[PDB]
Write an enzyme that holds these catalytic residues in place. Structure first.
Site, short mmCIF file in Angstrom:
data_model
loop_
_atom_site.label_atom_id
_atom_site.label_comp_id
_atom_site.label_asym_id
_atom_site.label_seq_id
_atom_site.Cartn_x
_atom_site.Cartn_y
_atom_site.Cartn_z
N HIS A 355 26.41 8.78 67.23
CA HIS A 355 25.15 9.10 66.57
C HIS A 355 25.41 9.80 65.31
O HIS A 355 24.43 10.14 64.69
CB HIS A 355 24.24 10.02 67.48
CG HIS A 355 23.95 9.46 68.89
ND1 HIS A 355 22.91 8.63 69.12
CD2 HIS A 355 24.67 9.59 70.09
CE1 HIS A 355 22.99 8.26 70.41
NE2 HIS A 355 24.03 8.82 71.01
N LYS A 546 11.80 16.57 60.34
CA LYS A 546 13.11 16.24 60.84
C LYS A 546 13.76 17.58 61.01
O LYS A 546 13.26 18.52 60.48
CB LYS A 546 13.95 15.29 59.95
CG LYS A 546 14.12 15.80 58.45
CD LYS A 546 14.70 14.73 57.47
CE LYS A 546 13.90 13.37 57.33
NZ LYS A 546 14.62 12.30 58.09
N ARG A 547 14.79 17.71 61.79
CA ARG A 547 15.39 19.05 61.87
C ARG A 547 15.96 19.48 60.47
O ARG A 547 16.37 18.64 59.69
CB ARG A 547 16.63 18.98 62.83
CG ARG A 547 16.30 18.92 64.36
CD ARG A 547 15.68 20.20 64.85
NE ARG A 547 16.67 21.25 64.77
CZ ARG A 547 17.33 21.69 65.84
NH1 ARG A 547 17.33 21.09 67.03
NH2 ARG A 547 17.93 22.79 65.65
N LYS A 552 20.41 16.37 55.18
CA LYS A 552 19.09 15.71 55.07
C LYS A 552 18.32 15.98 53.69
O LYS A 552 17.36 15.31 53.28
CB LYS A 552 18.32 16.21 56.27
CG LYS A 552 18.83 15.67 57.58
CD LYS A 552 18.12 16.34 58.79
CE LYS A 552 18.51 15.78 60.25
NZ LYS A 552 18.09 14.32 60.54
N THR A 654 15.12 7.67 62.92
CA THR A 654 14.08 6.97 63.68
C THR A 654 12.73 7.42 63.30
O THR A 654 11.74 6.76 63.53
CB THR A 654 14.24 7.28 65.19
OG1 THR A 654 14.27 8.72 65.50
CG2 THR A 654 15.33 6.45 65.85
N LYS A 658 9.30 5.64 62.52
CA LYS A 658 7.92 5.97 62.92
C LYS A 658 6.94 5.92 61.77
O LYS A 658 5.84 5.38 61.91
CB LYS A 658 7.88 7.36 63.52
CG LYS A 658 8.80 7.47 64.81
CD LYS A 658 9.14 8.94 65.20
CE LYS A 658 10.28 8.96 66.15
NZ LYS A 658 10.50 10.36 66.26
#
Ligand SMILES: O=C(Nc1ccccc1Oc1ccc(C(=O)O)c(C(=O)O)c1)c1cccc([N+](=O)[O-])c1
Ligand SMILES: O=C(Nc1ccccc1Oc1ccc(C(=O)O)c(C(=O)O)c1)c1cccc([N+](=O)[O-])c1
Lengths: 813, 813
Positions: A355, A546-547, A552, A654, A658
């Site tokens: 992952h 998102k975390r 990110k 993911t 969404k």
């Protein structure tokens, strides 16, 4: 009421079915909650509803597992440390077709159901994408009529609930079981024992593990209803129990039972605590003894040859990688199989999923820890490695170095076990979670592994379920799509492709736009109600949820934000598209930067959301306690989706998917599954910007110089000065010095390198927004080609190219 | 089946009522236990039964408390640290008339109910007589139609389960909630906060308690059904919850919640641990805030004048004595009443019960402990004392010494608070638990207190309920009595007096004897089954069951036992009446002697139960894990009841009374309520032996010389030598040196002084046993005059002479 009714995808409110519903509500409220209407409080209402819903599951639950018992299929076990499940009431009404019956029933008991649903505590038993992937997977297997079981740990405390205080995250404990769980069923009569510490004694039977401590694993089964097919599968979650002066000895029972207390909140990061390894052993040991035991009560040396025809054990990361030396322990030590058959058996049972490419995700366990806790496991791990490493030798004669790089055992000041290597040795398939990531595993991270055993390596791009992630969360969008193309899409999301025929349909263009604007209004009402935050509903909703992490690039978004603001103040009279920029998500406690970043975001909002010149042109908010349930609200209201990680660091994503499904346009990089989403839609229907992976690598090759960017870009130079000097924190000018230092001198994620392209791309986005019609036609294009990112797809591929079972949509009686 | 049927006192098995029962069993098994008949295990059966039973409670439960809500009576609260409740299934069937319907239902589902009842875990939430007194009291108040509430603490762990190992007691944790409790109902919506530690700040409002820690009290209500009257009252039990780096902080939640973990197992003994004081504060604080809150939602300065017309708070010992300075805290600090009214109010609310004369039962709390934990409480306690002690002065001018003896505050190296003094100051009535004890409180222990306020002092002799303690446990004896005199006796036990008309009735004499012999056979079967112990069923069953302690004189019984044995070996051919001597009960961990004593008893049995000369003439067994449920088996099978404590140390007793009720003859001293039992029956119908209290006192006056007895009695000298030299422990000759030392040099309980009279009295007992007819006529006399020792009696006196409420037997609709 009136929308809820009209909504065809929500079922029939049948006259006797409503009659029975009301009946069973009153009956539960009387016998279960021990109440009358004069003293129930909302929460008793919820439970009256949730008991009656669950009564509709039971007979299907019993017969489904009866079905597995009788037929004896090959069984899929999905081992994870995380099921990021969320709330369950609606979900189950949905998959049981009961939502408009229960909606009508409770109206007619003078209770708003939606109001009662918000009473439910999320089952927050995960950290972010993998844990939620796991929850989506459970659903899809049920929907596919697989004899699948989810296996994990019943935590006391899921992911902390997040409070923002004075702009900061505060962790509170998520005591999700306070009031009870109407969903779980305790399974006392299936309790197993789990052995910690001890020692190993070699005798003439072979090896024997002795003087162990014993913790008991108690299983709590939960029904996973399939979509409208009368499958109901099980999640089995283990809880730690103490075995069966005086007072201090009872009190100390705590210590063994703290095994299930709490999800460790580190997402995309290995902290190597023995409490965590215990969690991981407990789950694995308990699960595999359950699993052997099944296998021994089903058909029938006869037995274990065929163990892989009858069992598949899927590894959600390296977290349950001890499953490999454990099966070897049982088989070898308990069952008395010769090591080579037992190894044929293991590799044929087990399969591993990755992952993460980042190094600091890897589980690397110091041997002393493993030697103390799990002395037998370490012996079997060393005989694993030797023989694996004698296989690398025999294939690569003289490649010493390769020996060393392939080894399970890492050298250093602390010797460690590379759990991902363990997994590669001990599995028949190793997969990544989007095409780019799975290529990189082959080309980089597990390159030598691929060379050895290229047939192990696979791709399985992620999905999300369209039940939770459309039908539940977005019943307006769900309905307008069923209006055109019917309902089959819900479990055949590829049918969405049919909506491409409507790109030029003025009713469809009108409806889509109508439903998003309806979602925007609700979301807005929720913010005012629950958290008394006022947003402009005629703005572009720009959402990054998102975390929080450096990869990110919440920071690059913050850059953009202070650009819009700074542009405005330059040229105050200029028109700009109005925006609501929502950033949301949790920091792992003890991730300093991430906590800095949360403070910076709300610091931005302090300036930005009080400028009178700005007015309602621009608003920055931080969204509190992002969780599953919150994702089901904000995502259907989003216009723009932020997917901005450097290329090569987001394995897949993911939340991307969404947003896609629910009529958000994407700005992102070609990373993870953003790349395949642009492929599905046509790149001309996305906002791709910045460095590709090759350009990151080129940067690395010569050197990242963030000063180069600072000197070249006056607009970026302006913000950095803003940050240093104390514009965002006047009462503490130096507050953001560790942000700036890191941007300036030690940015692993290349923020400034994607700055200029990000800002220009965001120009593009707002240009397009000024043409409603054209935005909504591109959105149609988006939604019409998101069907690849259903988890039915992903799951049917795992079944067919890993588990060696055929899916199915044939209804159980 | 066939006895159970015939038994009239067990109800009607009505045709539709059975039809509904079976229906609701299957319905629970399907929806609750999630089962079919192919996979339920017995324990699911139990729960299917226990859910359906409980469904019969609910509507009565709701309306009873509705009833209190509407009518608003004066409410009785019964504060205890202990409700020695036992199992509940049968109990509730009994009080609901459902036992022959459920008996028929489950037969007809192909399940033996009695077999399912044994699945139930006792609620062992007490140590011995007081805690069980509390449970008997709950029942009797319901049966009397009182608006009574029991209030206590929901323990995780009740009294340890006892295992005998190698002749020793082993404590195991009593994890009574493992599998769930179908009886309790969580009351989340009534949670209160409890404040520990902090400090006190005096300002212009007065005093204010600040920087406190907060533990939450969560209440779990349980239905107390009255006997067949459609009252169902509540026991409310509080459980500790934590308030609403990261991981260590969640784990540490333990520490505040360990408040409810575990009953301290010290019976008849003050160990002064702060964990215990926290338990005691928590219960008190939570209860009284519940209680004030009620009071503030009922009728209506108006308010608190009348607080004592509306509230009665009964103190089960000094354990919840902090209730006194707590009510003062609220009233004073929160409610703002002037101290003098608040004191009028307190004394008028609260009343205290004593269960103990022994000094080492007293709660004497060091002030530093109380100053740290509960700093405000200690201030109010010192203003209590001063003013009380200014009242002693004004009544006893110049009696300095009396000042000092009366004071709440004890001097020494550690200053302490005498909690019993606290209770005397702060209560309107102080009672003892049998006439002799209550006289001694007046004449000794609280003599100066009596002189001050003689109108405070009262007696309330104990009782036991005849539901549990006849109808449940002994349905044969219950039935043969209903056959003559009907059923009213069950809630009017004085009607037993009517059986005196049958003393010369050959059918009655035959039946009584028949029922005891039937109980003896069952008990015997239980011992063979559960613990593979073989007893002679044609022996005199000689039973001493009670917690183990030096005052109770298990040792004097052991003396007798080794006499019978030694006599036999002298004269082997002589006839003797066959005996089974059963000794049973727990030691408080850390009570050394008591643990010694348990080892000595089983050591006796090792010799005695292997002599071939002895054969089946004499058998010594130790009964394991004596508990409530075990008491309901052994007591109906007992011929002789041992009640042998020194005179003056057993305040009352209630096991005395249970044996009485069920057709056991008593050997005892004139102690506690043995004295009133001999009064009721005529002393000629009992075995009274040894020192009266006056003779104990005379002994004390000159000196107890155990050597005097040893030199004078060759038979006692023989045993002592047996013990020292190692007859009872050959492999460890010296094992019992601390028994002998204590007997010899430091016996506070005068064992040897009652030896010769005990042995001779036991001669008498066995003489009588050789005449069956004459034994059974004396037993009739016994049973016919035990009606005074019903708890309805005791409770109706508390209501009338303490609470200032009238009882009642009028059925609720
Ligand atoms: O009884 C259930 N199903 C039945 C009915 C009859 C035989 C086998 C059943 O389910 C079973 C029973 C045992 C097993 C096992 O793990 O050994 C299996 C299996 O997974 O192969 C399925 C059942 C299904 C779902 C939930 C519960 N429950 O909560 O106890 C019970
Ligand atoms: O609802 C119940 N009884 C009713 C019905 C309507 C009004 C008042 C009721 O009971 C009540 C409600 C509130 C109170 C209170 O403590 O303030 C009282 C009281 O003790 O004075 C009685 C009830 C009775 C027994 C059990 C449950 N239960 O478990 O929740 C609920």
């Amino acid at each position: 009421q009136e929308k809820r009714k009209q909504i065809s995808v929500r079922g029939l409110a049948g006259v006797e079915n409503v009659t029975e519903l009301k009946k069973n509500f009153n009956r539960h409220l009387h016998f279960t909650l021990v109440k009358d209407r004069n003293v129930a409080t909302p929460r008793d209402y919820y439970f009256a509803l949730a008991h009656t819903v669950r009564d509709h599951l039971v007979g299907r639950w019993i017969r489904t597992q009866q079905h597995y018992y009788e037929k004896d299929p090959k069984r899929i076990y999905y081992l994870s440390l995380e099921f990021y499940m969320g709330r369950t009431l609606q979900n189950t009404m949905v998959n049981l077709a009961l939502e408009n019956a229960c909606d009508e029933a409770t109206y007619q008991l003078g209770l708003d159901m939606e109001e009662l649903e918000e009473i439910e505590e999320d089952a927050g038993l995960g950290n972010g994408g993998l844990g939620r992937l796991a929850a989506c997977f459970l659903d899809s297997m049920a929907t596919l009529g697989l004899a699948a079981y989810g296996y994990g740990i019943r935590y006391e405390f899921g992911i902390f609930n997040q409070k923002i205080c004075g702009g900061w995250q505060m962790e509170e404990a998520d005591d999700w079981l306070r009031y009870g769980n109407p969903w779980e069923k305790a399974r006392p009569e299936f309790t197993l024992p789990v052995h910690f510490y001890g020692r190993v004694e070699h005798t003439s039977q072979g090896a024997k593990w002795v003087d162990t401590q014993v913790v008991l694993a108690m299983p709590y089964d939960t029904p996973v209803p399939g979509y409208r097919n009368n499958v109901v599968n099980t999640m089995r979650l283990w809880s730690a129990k103490a075995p069966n002066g005086y007072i201090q000895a009872v009190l100390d029972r705590n210590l063994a039972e703290n095994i299930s207390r709490v999800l460790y909140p580190n997402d995309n990061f290995f902290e190597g605590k023995e409490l965590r390894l215990k969690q991981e052993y407990f789950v694995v040991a308990a699960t595999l003894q359950d699993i052997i035991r099944r296998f021994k009560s089903s058909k029938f040396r006869t037995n274990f040859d065929a163990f892989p025809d009858k069992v598949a054990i899927q590894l959600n990361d390296t977290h349950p990688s001890l499953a490999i030396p454990e099966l070897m322990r049982v088989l070898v030590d308990l069952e008395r199989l010769d090591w080579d058959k037992a190894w044929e058996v293991t590799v044929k049972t087990c399969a591993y999923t990755n992952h993460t490419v980042i190094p600091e995700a890897l589980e690397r366990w110091p041997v002393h820890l493993l030697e103390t806790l799990l002395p037998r496991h370490l012996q079997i791990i060393y005989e694993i490695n030797q023989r694996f490493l004698n296989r690398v030798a025999a294939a690569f004669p003289g490649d010493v170095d390769r020996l060393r790089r392939m080894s399970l055992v890492e050298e250093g000041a602390v010797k460690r076990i590379n759990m991902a290597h363990l997994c590669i040795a001990g599995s028949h398939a190793v997969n990544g979670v989007a095409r780019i990531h799975s290529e990189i595993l082959k080309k980089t991270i597990f390159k030598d592994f691929y060379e050895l055993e290229p047939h192990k390596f696979q791709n399985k791009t992620n999905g999300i379920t369209p039940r939770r992630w459309l039908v539940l969360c977005n019943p307006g969008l769900a309905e307008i799509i069923a209006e055109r193309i019917g309902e089959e899409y819900i479990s055949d999301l590829d049918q969405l492709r049919k909506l491409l025929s409507y790109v030029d349909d003025e009713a469809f263009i009108r409806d889509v736009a109508k439903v998003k604007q309806e979602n925007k209004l609700k979301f807005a009402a929720y913010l005012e109600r629950e958290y008394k935050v006022h947003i402009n509903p005629n703005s572009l909703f720009d959402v990054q949820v998102k975390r929080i992490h450096e990869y990110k690039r919440q920071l690059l978004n913050c850059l953009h934000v202070i650009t819009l603001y700074n542009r405005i103040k330059k040229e105050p009279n200029k028109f700009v598209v109005p925006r609501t920029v929502m950033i949301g998500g949790k920091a792992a406690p003890g991730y300093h930067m991430a906590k800095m970043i949360i403070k910076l975001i709300t610091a931005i909002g302090d300036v930005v959301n009080h400028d009178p010149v700005v007015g309602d042109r621009l608003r920055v908010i931080f969204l509190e306690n992002y969780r599953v349930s919150l994702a089901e609200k904000v995502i259907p209201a989003a216009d723009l989706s932020e997917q901005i990680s450097t290329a090569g660091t987001e394995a897949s994503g993911t939340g991307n998917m969404k947003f896609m499904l629910n009529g958000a346009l994407t700005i992102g990089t070609m990373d993870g599954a953003n790349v395949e989403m642009a492929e599905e839609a046509g790149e001309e229907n996305f906002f791709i910007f910045g460095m590709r992976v090759e350009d990151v690598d080129r940067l690395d090759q010569r050197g990242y110089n963030a000063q180069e960017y600072y000197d070249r870009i006056p607009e970026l130079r302006q913000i950095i000065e803003q940050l240093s000097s104390g514009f965002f924190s006047p009462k503490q000018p130096d507050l953001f010095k560790d942000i700036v230092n890191m941007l300036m001198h030690h940015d692993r994620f290349k923020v400034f390198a994607d700055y200029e392209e990000y800002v220009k791309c965001q120009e593009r986005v707002s240009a397009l927004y000024k043409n409603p019609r054209e935005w909504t036609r591109m959105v149609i294009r988006n939604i019409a080609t998101s069907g690849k990112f259903s988890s039915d797809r992903t799951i049917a591929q795992y079944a067919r190219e890993i588990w060696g079972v055929e899916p199915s949509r044939q209804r159980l009686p």
